Amino acid sequence: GTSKLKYVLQDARFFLIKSNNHENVSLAKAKGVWSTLPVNEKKLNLAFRSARSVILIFSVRESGKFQGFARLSSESHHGGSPIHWVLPAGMSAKMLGGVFKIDWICRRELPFTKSAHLTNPWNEHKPVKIGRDGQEIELECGTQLCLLFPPDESIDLYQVIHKM
């Protein structure tokens, strides 16, 4: 059903994550980690302490789709077991140095054509697919966007609920 999902999304905050390649999103799905640039890492760390749930909604550039969404389970941390991201051009490895732990809520894709009716008040009411990496999505838009994804019956939201 969708009732446990709605409970997880209650009063959540939402952020758009734009990845330049599929490899890093695949790595994030396998390992449960994400790294972003320091300006967004600061925003996510602040948001993590402010909200019951912080949801990252992922989209790979040029893919025309979202690739799923996940909940932050921790603030960013440094050191740790190394990741091995595929770095875009001009992108340093120390710029992606902060690592967040995430729990996937949905690993299924959603095409942008399916969210064309959703606009984001925090980005001038442009379609929610539009935004830079780290753009915050307002609560009602983010909730409805997450509700559009196909259900991921491989994930049990019971463990997610206990971390709130």
The backbone torsions φ and ψ at residue 138, rounded to the nearest 5 degrees and listed phi first, read -60, 150
The backbone torsions φ and ψ at residue 100, rounded to the nearest 5 degrees and listed phi first, read -100, 145
Say if CB 140 and CB 10 are below 8 A apart. Answer: no
- Is 35 annotated for ligand binding? yes
State how beta strands 13-19 and 54-60 pair. Answer: parallel
Tokens describing residue 110: 């959603």
Radius of gyration of the chain, Cα coordinates, nearest whole angstrom: 15
Q: How far apart are CA 48 and CA 26, in angstroms?
A: 23
Residues 6+ apart with CB under 8 A from 137: 14, 15, 16, 57, 120, 122, 128, 131, 145
- Is 133 annotated for ligand binding? yes
Q: How far apart are CA 146 and CA 113, in angstroms?
A: 14
Question: Does an H or E element contain 28, and which?
Answer: helix 22-31
Say if CB 97 and CB 2 are below 8 A apart. Answer: no
> Around Cβ 132, how many Cβ atoms within 10 Å?
9
- Is 156 annotated for ligand binding? no
Q: Method used for this model?
A: X-ray
Q: How far apart are CA 130 and CA 59, in angstroms?
A: 10
Strand partners, 99: 77
Could you tell me the residue ranges of all domains in the chain? 1-164
CA distances, 130 to each of 16, 59, 101, 113, 124 (Å): 9, 10, 25, 12, 10
Say if CB 82 and CB 41 are below 8 A apart. Answer: no
- Is 122 annotated for ligand binding? no
Query: What is the maximal distance between C-alpha atoms in the chain?
Result: 44
- Is 63 annotated for ligand binding? no
- Is 104 annotated for ligand binding? no
CATH for 1-164, among 3.30.390.50, 3.40.1670.10, 3.90.226.10, 3.10.590.10? 3.10.590.10
CA distances, 83 to each of 1, 57, 89 (Å): 34, 20, 18
Say if CB 5 and CB 105 are below 8 A apart. Answer: yes
